[PDB]
Design a protein around this ligand. Sequence first.
Ligand SMILES: CCCCCCCCCCCCCCCCCC(=O)OC[C@H](COP(=O)([O-])OCC(O)COP(=O)([O-])OC[C@@H](COC(=O)CCCCCCCCCCCCCCCCC)OC(=O)CCCCCCCCCCCCCCCCC)OC(=O)CCCCCCCCCCCCCCCCC
Ligand SMILES: CCCCCCCCCCCCCCCCC[C@@H](O)O[C@H](CO[C@H](O)CCCCCCCCCCCCCCC)COP(=O)(O)OCC[N+](C)(C)C
Ligand SMILES: CCCCCCCCCCCC(=O)OC[C@H](COP(=O)([O-])O)OC(=O)CCCCCCCCCCC
Lengths: 174, 121
Amino acid sequence: PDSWDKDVYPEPPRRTPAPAPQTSLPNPVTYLTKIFDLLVDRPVTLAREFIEQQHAKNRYYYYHREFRRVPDITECEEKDILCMFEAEMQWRRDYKVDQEIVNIIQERLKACQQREGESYRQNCAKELEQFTQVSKAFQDRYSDLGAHYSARKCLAKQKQRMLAERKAAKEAAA
Amino acid sequence: TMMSGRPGRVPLQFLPNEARSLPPPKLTDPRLVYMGFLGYCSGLIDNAIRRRPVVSAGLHRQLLYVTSFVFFGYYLLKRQDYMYALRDHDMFAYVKSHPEDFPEKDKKTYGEILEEFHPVR
Ligand SMILES: CCCCCCCCCCCCCCCCCC(=O)OC[C@H](COP(=O)([O-])OCC(O)COP(=O)([O-])OC[C@@H](COC(=O)CCCCCCCCCCCCCCCCC)OC(=O)CCCCCCCCCCCCCCCCC)OC(=O)CCCCCCCCCCCCCCCCC
Ligand SMILES: CCCCCCCCCCCCCCCCC[C@@H](O)O[C@H](CO[C@H](O)CCCCCCCCCCCCCCC)COP(=O)(O)OCC[N+](C)(C)C
Ligand SMILES: CCCCCCCCCCCC(=O)OC[C@H](COP(=O)([O-])O)OC(=O)CCCCCCCCCCC
């Protein structure tokens, strides 16, 4: 459907086998599906058609809010409260966006596991790798900031990580 | 005594002439309203102690209580504002006069400042 992006929420093309009966007995599932279509599907479809027809008469729109980029805590001077506040708010919004990214990847993983069913171990290796990478990056960024997390604390953690990486690289090149 | 003995201080002067250059408190100052509330409470306590109807008796007495409290509160607010303004003025003058004691400092961003990170686990 056009409600969601098929690229953001991937789904393999469905392959439903054609029915090839081998008995002269009737199909109770087929009969019950026909009865369900005649008793439930058509009434709910008519009701939804009327509701959508009512909706189309008073059509109106809502928008997606856009935020421009602002200087971050690295650019903010020491004890500059206005810039610090702006950077903290931007960092919090980006944190929420990253959380939703991790949620999207996790939902993709769950859906692929359920879809593949009995052979999920092999067929879902692609989605497990993406989740592994995303979770590793997210954990490295926001692992142990604490209850009173802040952009300053995350920046300090990144500085510590960069210092450790630089020391390791210098030791390797030595 | 911090501000006592300040140069040019006239003894026993509640409000000097230099206080006239400051913005007077507005008549609707919340501090003045609280002073009037204190006056009203004083009138109510007067009625209660003298065993009169608390809200009804002595309307003139309650009015005089409120008016006196508002008057003294207005003058007290004027003096308080003048003293705080004088303190700030003297502090700024001293900061201007002692740049060696109050020097400007180089401002370095958090990208340059190294702060230790304490993990919570
Ligand atoms: C305004 C409402 C209250 C707000 C309170 C906020 C804080 C400020 C307090 C100011 C108090 C002023 C009055 C003090 C004396 C009261 C005496 C009394 O009994 O009065 C009864 C009197 C009515 O009864 P009554 O038959 O006339 O009284 C005859 C006998 O006195 C009847 O007495 P009795 O001979 O039958 O003896 C019985 C009673 C006699 O004893 C009493 O009734 C107690 C009298 C002293 C109470 C404390 C006075 C204030 C001290 C400072 C409070 C600090 C509060 C904050 C700190 C935390 C709490 C402590 O003794 C006992 O019950 C003994 C057992 C209990 C003892 C332990 C508790 C004692 C009080 C502790 C709490 C104190 C704070 C709350 C005070 C509330 C006072 C109404 O009630 C009032 O007058 C209440 C105030 C009415 C104000 C009306 C204003 C005009 C209309 C509304 C306009 C609103 C604004 C509109 C704006 C524009 C809109 C368009
Ligand atoms: C709530 C507690 C009780 C408050 C009631 C206090 C009553 C004070 C009695 C005098 C009040 C009116 C005085 C007005 C005329 C006299 C003014 C002048 O003579 O005195 C001034 C000084 O007096 C006071 O400034 C005026 C009275 C101030 C009282 C304010 C009480 C603040 C308490 C905080 C709670 C607020 C309560 C609000 C309701 C009162 C200037 O004299 P000065 O030579 O320069 O001071 C010498 C003192 N030195 C040496 C230490 C410097
Ligand atoms: C100024 C020139 C005008 C003419 C001269 C006037 C002189 C002074 C006025 C006299 C007041 C008066 O006679 O009546 C006082 C009334 C109630 O009278 P009473 O029956 O309680 O004795 O009400 C009172 O009791 C007053 C209550 C006030 C108590 C004190 C309040 C203090 C204010 C500041 C406190 C911080």
